[PDB]
Amino acid sequence: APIVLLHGFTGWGREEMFGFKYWGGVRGDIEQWLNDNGYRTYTLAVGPLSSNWDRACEAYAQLVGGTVDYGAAHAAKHGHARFGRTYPGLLPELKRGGRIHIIAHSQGGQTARMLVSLLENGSQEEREYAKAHNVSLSPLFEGGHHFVLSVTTIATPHDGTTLVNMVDFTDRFFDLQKAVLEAAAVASNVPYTSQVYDFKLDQWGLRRQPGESFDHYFERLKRSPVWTSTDTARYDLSVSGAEKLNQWVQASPNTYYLSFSTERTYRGALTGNHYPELGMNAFSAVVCAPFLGSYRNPTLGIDDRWLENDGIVNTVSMNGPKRGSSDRIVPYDGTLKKGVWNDMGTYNVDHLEIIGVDPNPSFDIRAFYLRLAEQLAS
Ligand SMILES: [Ca+2]
Ligand SMILES: [Zn+2]
C-alpha cells in the first residue's frame, strides 16, 4: 500500500510556499526520502483551518478524483457551499481495490480518523437528508468503503489541546501561522501577488487578494466563519470539540492505528509546572509552552498529567482518543494490532521539529520516517 501524508492546522502542497515542504521543512523532503527508499508516497493538501469534516471530504476527492462534496445536510447546516474544487485523483487504484497508509501530523490525525469513519460507516444524517430532499449523495456518505489500511498519527491532539484556552488564543494562533511562514522565509507583511499559501476556503468564499499581506488576510480570517463558526479546525482542536469528535469517530476494526507522542519540556520541582527545553522552536517556547505547562482546570479534568507538552499540544492528548472515546490503546509490543491504537512511544522532539519545520540536529528525522515506513510495510 502507498503512504499518503496529511498535515494539521498549518500545511500546503508541494508546489506551494516556494517549495519549502511541510513534510521535511529545513531538514529536507520526507516524501522524497520515502520514495527514494522504495516506499511509494504521496502528499495531500487540504484546508488547514477548515473543520475535520471539510478536510476529510477534500481528502476523499483528492485521492479518488472528482468534485469535493461536503454533504447537502452539512452545507445547509453551516451555511457554506456544498461543492468545492475538482481534483484529478492521486490514486485511482483506490477505486480498484487498492488501500493506503495515512501518516498524519497534528490535526491531520483527527482528519485521518474521520475519513476512515466516513469511509466505513458513511453518514446517516447525509443519507436521510438526500432521501428527504431528493438530492444526490456522495459515495463517501454511503458507508462500506474500506480503502484505508492504517492511520499513523504524530503529535495529534486526539483529546484536544489546552492551547485554545489561552487568553489571547485568537491572536497567538495567527502569530503561530506567521511563525510557520517565517520558517519558510515567507514574510507576513509583504504584499505577495503569487498565491504562496492557499487556505483553500472556496466553500466560505474567502481568498487572499493579490498584494494583500498575510497580516491583513489573517485579520479578515479571524472575523470570518472559518474562525467564528463551529465548522472549524478551531472548534475541533479544543478539549470540548475533540471530545465531541471522539463520540462518533471510532477506530475501525479493519484498520491499524499507530500513534507517536512528542514532549519537549522539563518539570519544575517547586510548582510542578512544565517548562520548555533548550532547542524548542522559539515561537512555542516564548508564546505557547509556558501556558501549556502551567494551565490547570479542575472542572474539565485538566490536571498535572496535561502539563507535559511539545510546545503546541499536551503530550497526554497524543496516544489516541480517550475523552469521549471507546477506542482501545495498547503499548506497541513488536506486532501491530488491528482495530486499536498501537502506542509507538513518546519522542523528545517538539511539534515542528518532528516534521522538520524547526531544526533539531540530534533528531534523525530521516531514520524516524524510514523506521515507521518499514513498520507499515512489514
Ligand atoms: Ca529546535
Ligand atoms: Zn463544513
Residue numbers in the entry: 8 to 385
Which passages does the manuscript contain on this structure?
In this paper, we report the crystallization and the crystal structure of a 43 kDa recombinant thermostable lipase isolated from Bacillus sp. L2. The structure possesses the known fold of the a/b hydrolase family, and contains both a calcium ion and a zinc ion. Lipases catalyze both the hydrolysis of triglycerides to glycerols and free fatty acids over an oil-water interface, and also the hydrolysis and transesterification of other esters as well as the synthesis of esters and exhibiting enantioselective properties. Bacterial lipases are members of the structural superfamily of α/β hydrolases whose enzymic activity results from the catalytic triad Ser-His-Asp, similar to that found in serine proteinases.
Crystallization of L2 lipase was done using a counter diffusion method in collaboration with JAXA (Japanese Aerospace Exploration Agency) under the JAXA-UPM Protein Crystal Growth (PCG) #1 Flight 1 program. The best Shape 2 L2 lipase crystal was diffracted at high resolution (1.5 Å) and belongs to the orthorhombic space group P212121, with unit-cell parameters a = 72.0, b = 81.8, c = 83.4 Å, α = β = γ = 90°. The core structure L2 lipase is made of a seven-stranded parallel sheet that is surrounded by a number of alpha helices; namely alpha helices 1 and 13 on one side, and alpha helices 2, 4, 5, 9,10, 11 and 12 on the opposite site of the structure. Based on the structural alignment of L2 lipase with other structurally-known lipases, the Ser113, Asp317 and His358 were assigned as the catalytic triad. The catalytic serine residue (Ser113) lies in the generously allowed region and situated on the nucleophilic elbow between strand b5 and helix a4 deep within the core structure. L2 lipase contains the Ala-Xaa-Ser-Xaa-Gly pentapeptide, which is the conserved form in Bacillus spp. The pentapeptide of L2 lipase consisted of Ala-His-Ser-Gln-Gly. The lid of the L2 lipase structure is formed by helix α6. In the L2 lipase structure, the Ca2+ is coordinated in an octahedral environment via Gly286 O, Glu360 O Asp365 O, Pro366 O and two water molecules. The Zn2+ is coordinated in a tetrahedral environment by two histidine N12 atoms (His81 and His87) located in helix α3, and two aspartate O atoms (Asp61 and Asp238). The Zn2+ is approximately 19 Å away from the catalytic serine residue, and is thus unlikely to participate in catalysis.
